[PDB]
Amino acid sequence: MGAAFTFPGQGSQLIGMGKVLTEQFVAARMVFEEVDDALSEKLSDIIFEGPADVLTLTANAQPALMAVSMAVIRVMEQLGLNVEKKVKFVAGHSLGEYSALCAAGTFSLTDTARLLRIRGNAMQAAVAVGEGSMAALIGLDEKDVEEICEIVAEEGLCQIANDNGGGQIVISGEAKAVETAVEVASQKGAKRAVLLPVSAPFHSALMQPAANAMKNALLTVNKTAPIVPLIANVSVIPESDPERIVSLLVQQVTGRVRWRETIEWISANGVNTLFEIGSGKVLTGLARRINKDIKALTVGTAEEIEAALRVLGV
């Protein structure tokens, strides 16, 4: 049966990502050139040479990861890919929703770069330093983590930020509450419970100022219905209405990334091959943990592009 394209998010960035592809294909080189122009900045120098901690800043990582994904898309398209004909659905992990929408034609490349810079800037600035944290948990189900969130409510706000599959759940919120939640998760026998004490509290109610910033930015940008539906992080259904998609992108900023349910939905609704478009193998690792029967393939190199085009029957 069919294919879905999935687009990675924060944590998939790597120094030098996309550099080889730009050397090999003008289609890839031009994506980075346009992103630099759109942002009035040589972002590509940070992408290709680091330092890693500068590339990892969310105001850099968000437009950078999208650029790598879109370079892959443009190379595939030059080599004959028609997305509307060959791809059933698109989806992406948080910032990856924007990459997915650009690949599906909803926003221009220049606008997507600017939207992601606005998003990263607004997220970095949403809460004062030290006020938020995140934590990465493995081995507790959603119900049990929701209970931990309730247990620590007296200390402060703690919410599920990502449900990633494979027993991986990321929590987020106020620093003290999240720290306590890690202690509780460890006590309950989590296989892993790791505090990220300086993280912005992504996908928590604390991100409200960044949601408001995205609402204003998304209201003015030119947009078109995507050529294939987006399986939105908030709704886990195929979305093609640009007005509703804008609302869901705003809601996404403060809400849970429902990634497990996304892969389960896609796999049950006529897709047997999940492609990860861009940098790294993070989503592919998750897909294989969620569903052992689907074929999950990375698409980041020339070789992988060729293989994906063959699987798609281009």
Site for Cl ion, rule CB under 5 A: 10-11
C-beta closer to Cl ion: residue 95 or 109: 95
**Rounded to an integer, what distance in angstroms lies between the CA atom of residue 206 and that of residue 158?**
10
| Nearest distance in Å: CB 98, Cl ion | 17
Spatial separation of the C-alpha atoms in residues 233 and 126, rounded to whole Å: 21
Smallest separation, CB 58 to Cl ion (Å): 8
Cis preceding-peptide flag for 51 (omega within 30 of 0): yes
Q: Which is nearer to Cl ion, 97 or 239 (CB)?
A: 97
For residue 21, what are its two tokens? 């592809």
The answer to whether 276 and 284 have CB atoms below 8 angstroms apart is yes
Least CB distance to Cl ion at residue 119 (A):
15
Shortest gap between Cβ of 221 and Cl ion (angstroms)?
26
CB of 204 to Cl ion, least distance (A): 17
Asked whether the beta carbons of 172 and 134 are under 8 A apart, the reply is yes
Q: Which residue number has the CB closest to Cl ion? A: 11
Of 109 and 257, which has the nearer Cβ to Cl ion?
A: 257
What is the DSSP code string of 215-267? HHHHHHS-----SS-EE-TTT-SEE--HHHHHHHHHHHHHS-B-HHHHHHHHH
CB of 276 to Cl ion, least distance (A): 16
Sign of torsion, CA 32 38 42 45? negative
**Residues involved in catalysis:** 94, 203
What tokens were used for 210?
Answer: 């960044």
195/190 Cα distance (integer angstroms) = 13
Structure tokens of 262? 């996304």
Which backbone phi and psi does 194 adopt, to 5 degrees? -120, 120
Minimum CB distance to Cl ion smaller for 11 or for 166: 11
Helix (H, G, I), strand (E, B) or coil at 235: coil
Q: Of the two residues 11 and 285, which places its CB atom closer to Cl ion in the complex?
A: 11
Q: Burial level of 11, CB count in 10 A (0-12/13-18/19+)?
A: middle
Cβ-contact 260, 233 below 8 angstroms: no
